[PDB]
Write a protein that binds this DNA or RNA. Structure first.
Ligand SMILES: [Mg+2]
Ligand SMILES: [Mg+2]
Ligand SMILES: [Mg+2]
Length: 127
RNA sequence: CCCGGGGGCCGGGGGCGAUACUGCCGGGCUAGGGGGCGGGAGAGGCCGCCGGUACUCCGGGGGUAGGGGCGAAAUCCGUUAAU
């Protein structure tokens, strides 16, 4: 039998965070961040960091019962970057190799339907 | 240079003529303008009510120990449970 769940990915430009939950999302089976499996701060948003963090979390997911999951990839949406960072693709690649059965893949980046004033003033982030 | 004569010295007033244009008075028009009627267009304004995601914070549940940020860090947030 297949027990289903959700692989939530947070792929910003500074890290990557993979929490695996049940279908309702109320219960977390595994959660690994990039810095949790990476030697230094500079290597957190690397795809290599995601690929280790992806396989490390999914290994716990299989050990704790979960055997098939969907993937919901996201970036920091709204007043930030509206697409997943440079580690989300590597994260899902290690997910497929981990033995999990893959369901649907969705982008759930929170899109503002207008917005709020974002940082960095008005001249820009180099002036 | 002096003498003689004509003109001008840009104007004022008088009389007699013309009425093309301007002016005034009278009559009449609709071409400029304004006032209308009809169906539509418009982030035009003021007021009232409602919504959409996003965000931040607060309360509770899951789960450990990182998160955040950078060129790289650090400050900072986090073991009174964070992301
Ligand atoms: Mg500034
Ligand atoms: Mg003379
Ligand atoms: Mg004289």
């Amino acid at each position: 039998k297949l027990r289903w769940g959700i692989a939530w990915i947070y792929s910003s430009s500074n890290n990557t965070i993979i929490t695996i939950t049940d279908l309702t999302g109320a219960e977390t089976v595994a959660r690994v961040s990039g810095g949790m499996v990476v030697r230094a701060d500079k290597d957190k948003p690397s795809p290599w960091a995601a690929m280790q963090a992806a396989y490390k979390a999914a290994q716990l997911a299989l050990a704790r019962g979960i055997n098939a999951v969907h993937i919901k990839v996201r970036g920091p949406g709204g007043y930030g970057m509206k697409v997943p960072g440079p580690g989300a693709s590597a994260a899902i690649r290690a997910l497929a190799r981990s033995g999990l059965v893959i369901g649907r893949i969705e982008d759930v980046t929170p899109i503002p339907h207008x917005t709020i004033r974002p940082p960095s003033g008005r001249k820009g982030r180099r002036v």
